[PDB]
Amino acid sequence: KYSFKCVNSLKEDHNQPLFGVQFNWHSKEGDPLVFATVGSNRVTLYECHSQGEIRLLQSYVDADADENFYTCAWTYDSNTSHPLLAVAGSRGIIRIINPITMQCIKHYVGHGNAINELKFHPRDPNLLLSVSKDHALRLWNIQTDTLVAIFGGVEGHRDEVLSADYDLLGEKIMSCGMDHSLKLWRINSKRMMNAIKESYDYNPNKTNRPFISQKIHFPDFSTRDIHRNYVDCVRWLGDLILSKSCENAIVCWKPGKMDDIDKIKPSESNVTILGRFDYSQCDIWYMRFSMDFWQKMLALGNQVGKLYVWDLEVDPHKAKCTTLTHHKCGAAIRQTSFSRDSSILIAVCDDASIWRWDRL
């Protein structure tokens, strides 16, 4: 159904892995199509132009020579309406880059170690979720520079948190990690909505109180029964979950029996599997799939440079798959990203190469 052609490739000069890539879906229509890549101590912006051109725009290089960025995510600046780019990695410091000036305008220290993923809330562009090697997720309000909530502890993850996603409504989060667990954390309670409201009301110039963070010790659901090894990428599909480990499949599943997501309580003993998307040669961890804006297609690169794209417009057992290869793309693909209009798919690799695929 979906066919793409490889129109160009570029390599960055640092020769370190590109761990992350994201198109800016928060651009204004008319704007050129821009994406960010992170690896080494760098964040780089590129624009896609005609005849396959991947045009270097500008870059931020961290003053710390031994920082290594792993992940980025785009949002809006609440003060101006223009885009912002959050980055983080091995140092465990969230940096908010203003992509206009390519300077760091805010940074957040708090995590005990490396940050593995960053996500923005789908309804509220100020609300940043980070997940960490310290076993916790944190929710920040980047307008008032406040830590709203820490998700961790008693029934929190017991090893590094590797990925998380908000659902479409931004009512709940699914996280996953090295403890081969997936954990659901609701954020639409009265308490949590009040906490977010208070975070906006906070101004340290008018008071000496600190801002009180919520400490959430108990997920609303937890399972270790989907995957056996490190779970490194999770994404909601409506009320269902897509997740993968290092076992060469993405599993489509739901908490409960074949059960309303919103009646699910922590005593739920079970899960239902609805389908799987099988592939090969993706058995190292920190390998992420993406979806298009409409969540009609799912793309994942593997450790030998193959790029799988599934048409999810289907019973998942029956989903059709396009395999995209190029004779010169042999290095491990860490992450992919579709343009907002789905016309372009970019893949980034361990050898610092970037691969541009255009929809036919």
Partner: peptide
């Protein structure tokens, strides 16, 4: 498992 190939 391993992060690197």
């Amino acid at each position: 498992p391993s992060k690197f190939l």
